[PDB]
Write a protein that binds this ligand. Sequence first.
Ligand SMILES: COc1ncc(Cl)cc1S(=O)(=O)Nc1ccc(F)c(C#Cc2cnc(N)nc2)c1F
Length: 252
Amino acid sequence: SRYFIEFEELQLLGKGAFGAVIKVQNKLDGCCYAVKRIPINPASRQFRRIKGEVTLLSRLHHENIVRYYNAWIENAVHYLYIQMEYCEASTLRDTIDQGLYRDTVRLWRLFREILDGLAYIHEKGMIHRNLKPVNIFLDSDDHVKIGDFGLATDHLAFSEALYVSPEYNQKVDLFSLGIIFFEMSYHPMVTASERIFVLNQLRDPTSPKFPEDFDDGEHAKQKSVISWLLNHDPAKRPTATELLKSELLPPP
Ligand SMILES: COc1ncc(Cl)cc1S(=O)(=O)Nc1ccc(F)c(C#Cc2cnc(N)nc2)c1F
């Protein structure tokens, strides 16, 4: 009703667990937005947790977080709509798959912005827990916007499987970022078999094992950073701030 009156639909962006993300245009302001539509059971524990994650994520304000506009409910069927910024340059996934790894200046900047975003999220006492390239978006100016926290997951620090830590502390996101930065640093992995094996070989308990064509004079710094992020022991991963301040990262 409000969704159909105020917006025009343009494009399916995604399908999650129980919901869709639709690219829409607002009739009044003429701007494109991404709207997530979640069918919801009102008065269920699932719902009341979702409403909590909405109150919590609505309070995030950072240049590297997808910008939040609006949340509302519509009516023997119920929908939750969440209106966010539409990011014109799609996902980090598309950018990795399109040969990001050959642009060392660019991928070092994008890595830094992801860190900016994680540092802010961690400073606010929150954890993403679902960090992966399809959940990092790129705006028209090629800046990182993190989103898709997941409304059914607790993001309060104090309370697909290839990005998940052996384990819930702040340090789960930084393990994930170690997998992500390897994919940013390495050639697009055409096949599923290559993807799963190469990444399972990083996540190997007995120290991260890199492919034969990464053990190079070229990818020395990148190797250090990832090895640090991918430590089995969470207490031995750096904080986003600790890494940001490190002189492993090239100049901004
Ligand atoms: C900061 O995140 C939040 N903040 C506050 C709250 Cl209330 C919820 C969240 S959320 O974590 O549920 N994210 C979320 C929710 C809804 C969405 F439509 C999107 C999107 C997108 C998108 C996809 N493709 C392209 N190209 N551009 C943009 C999203 F990311």
